[PDB]
Structure formats: structure tokens, C-alpha cells
């Protein structure tokens, strides 16, 4: 357990990197979506998802 605590920073950094890669791939797929109506629906859902995350964060902070 002590070793895992020592290694704790590395695991968080790796987890953050894998989320950055997943987010980058999601943006690339949205960019690559040929149909403008599909692209808009995906973009609106992504933005609303972010907004829900922001509201949830603000509620937890409150």
C-alpha cells in the first residue's frame, strides 16, 4: 500500500492523459462528421454534457 501511495502521482497523470486523448478523439470524430445536422446534434449534446458537468461541479463546491 505504501508503494501504491508513492506511485499515486504517476497514476493520476496517466489517467488525465488518457482522458485528454479520449476528449481529443471525440473532438476529431465531431470534426470528421460529414453531415452538418449530425455534427450539430453531436456538438450540442457535447456542450450540454459539459454544462451539466459544470453545474454539478458548482453544486458540489457550494
Amino acid at each position: 500500500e505504501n508503494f501504491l501511495k508513492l506511485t499515486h502521482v504517476q497514476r493520476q497523470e496517466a489517467a488525465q492523459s488518457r482522458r485528454e486523448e479520449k476528449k481529443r478523439a471525440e473532438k476529431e470524430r465531431i470534426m470528421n462528421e460529414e453531415d452538418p445536422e449530425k455534427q450539430r446534434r453531436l456538438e450540442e449534446a457535447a456542450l450540454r454534457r459539459e454544462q451539466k458537468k459544470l453545474e454539478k461541479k458548482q453544486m458540489k463546491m457550494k
Binding site: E1, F3, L4, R11, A14, A15
Partner: protein, 153 residues
């Protein structure tokens, strides 16, 4: 938190937990004993088949009135059911344990669900209405859950 069984090796073992999960405790104890030793791909596949009624859940300890099905002759039992709310609660929890073994860098395709127990949570209380002006309890039986997976190659 303080679990019941501690893993034999904390690095290659992931944990999960659930408190006041509005499921049925008897159903969750049975679909947890069905999962108790499986491999995590076997489990997610089984628990999806339970929701699609391609495999069942043998009801062994709480089997009053629990009718007989044909898909229980694989467990050498006669009675069984297809708990959907209870195959989806300890599937969102098997997903949580997956996303907790990736936070530890384990091999998700090598995880065996090693320890899994279901406890009994505080009952929530409602009331029904019966004949001759009598009111009765209509209490809910929630459960606590907690699993521990482990890399076992």
C-alpha cells in the same frame, strides 16, 4: 472504506461499494452468488444475458414460490429468475470496479471477481391501506453491496 475481506495483494486487486441501493436484497444476494467466482467478461456477458433472458439466476436460499425455469439446469438447480434491476445494479458497479482497475493500471481482461457480498440496508417505510380501516407497513428492503476483483492469470 473498511470492507469485510481484505485482498491478498492490494496492487492487483480493485474494490467497489454501494450503499442504500434501492434494489431487492434477496434478488441481489442471488445474482451476486451467481457472479461470485466469474471472470469479469463472463460476468458482464452473463448479467446482460440475464436482462435478455438468455440465461437465468438460480434461486437457492430465497426460493419460496420462485417458479421453475428451464435455464437453471446449468446450475444443477430447479428454480431461478431474471432479476433485471439487480442485474443492472451490480453491472453499473462492475463498471465502476473496471474504471477503478484502470485507475490502478490493471489488466481489465484478466480480472476475476474474487470477493462479492451483499448486506441489508436500512428499510425505507411507506404504508398501505387494508380492510376495516387498518393501515399496514409497506417497507422497502434495500441492500449494501461490495465487490473486490483481482488479477488471476
Amino acid at each position: 472504506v473498511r470492507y469485510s475481506l481484505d485482498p491478498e495483494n492490494p496492487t492487483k486487486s480493485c474494490k467497489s461499494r454501494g450503499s442504500n441501493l434501492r434494489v431487492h436484497f434477496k434478488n441481489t444476494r442471488e445474482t451476486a452468488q451467481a457472479i461470485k467466482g466469474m471472470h469479469i467478461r463472463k460476468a458482464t456477458k452473463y448479467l446482460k444475458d440475464v436482462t435478455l433472458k438468455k440465461q437465468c439466476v438460480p434461486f437457492r436460499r430465497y426460493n419460496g414460490g420462485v417458479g421453475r425455469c428451464a435455464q437453471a439446469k446449468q446450475w444443477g438447480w430447479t428454480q431461478g429468475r431474471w432479476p433485471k434491476k439487480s442485474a443492472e445494479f451490480l453491472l453499473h458497479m462492475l463498471k465502476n470496479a473496471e474504471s477503478n482497475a484502470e485507475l490502478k493500471g490493471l489488466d481489465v481482461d484478466s480480472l476475476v471477481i474474487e470477493h462479492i457480498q451483499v448486506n441489508k440496508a436500512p428499510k425505507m417505510r411507506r404504508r398501505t391501506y387494508r380492510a376495516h380501516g387498518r393501515i399496514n407497513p409497506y417497507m422497502s428492503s434495500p441492500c449494501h453491496i461490495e465487490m473486490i476483483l483481482t488479477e488471476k492469470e
